[PDB]
Amino acid sequence: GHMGNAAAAKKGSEQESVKEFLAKAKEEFLKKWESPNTAQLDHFDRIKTLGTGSFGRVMLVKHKETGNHYAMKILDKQKVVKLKQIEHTLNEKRILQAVNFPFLVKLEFSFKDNSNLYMVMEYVPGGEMFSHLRRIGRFSEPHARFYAAQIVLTFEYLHSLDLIYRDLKPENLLIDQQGYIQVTDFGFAKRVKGRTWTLCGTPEYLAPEIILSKGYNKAVDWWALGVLIYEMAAGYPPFFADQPIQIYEKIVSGKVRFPSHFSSDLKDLLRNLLQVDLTKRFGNLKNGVNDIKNHKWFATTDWIAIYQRKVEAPFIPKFKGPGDTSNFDDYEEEEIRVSINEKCGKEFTEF
């Protein structure tokens, strides 16, 4: 066979140890999920805007008492208007409170006021993968593989807890001071036992079953991993067009073309992740995540060493000190105004 005796037994033992780890991780998650750390806005100084979206912004803040820096996500309750926007914000907070994994950003505080919802996270100063990727063009296959391995392990963890992530893309992956990934933005994450039906995500990363309004499962995250690996290794994603409607048509087609510099091992992995047929998509078969972890493209990956952060990273971001923002792009700095009247109190009671 492909493995000799020694290798096969080591791999089997490794896989049983994963099961043991995930069983303990589920016990810990459920304790926090069933029985969940506030603060207030005046406890922080505003430093700089780190990113912006439709519903608000992420700000570098400095906590007055301790001097620690944090990333504060601010959501305008009055912008969180649509039904699915509201439930998603409750999902995000509850999931972040309860998870614990080396590649998932750590939530420190959450609170709300008359105008806004706030989630205060660890500040990850190395910047978004997105900007580093756009600046360099594309990552080498070894470098893309180092980042991909962290996503594979993170999804193995999340999916074992019945959590789907639903917004993988380079914009959401921060680089920490050791060059490892921190997944941020759990705005689309959800606990799902089987199917779910919300049409949400980012166009270029949507699995076909989402676009086609079919009830879907955690396999959408494995499709998205295929999109991510392709984009990291090529410099652009596999379904690439100026407008979302054109992107959707390419996704549904079942057609992917690869740069001539992609290795055959990489193309094989990607054709099995970017598989429209759910009975054939890697991550969705009888062998689960092991079809991905044991693929030839990952043959050099030491999964435990990645988890332990003992693999040398491709890139260590430069950091001049606490609160450095040099690895982030600049954004318009807009007022953060808090109304004297409570807005949307009833719809956010649970937050």
């Binding site: 926007q85 995500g201 166009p203």
Partner: peptide, 13 residues
């Protein structure tokens, strides 16, 4: 041709 800038997620397409 395609989108090179940051991509916004859509909550309800």
């Amino acid at each position: 041709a395609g989108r090179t800038g940051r991509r916004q997620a859509i909550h309800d397409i």
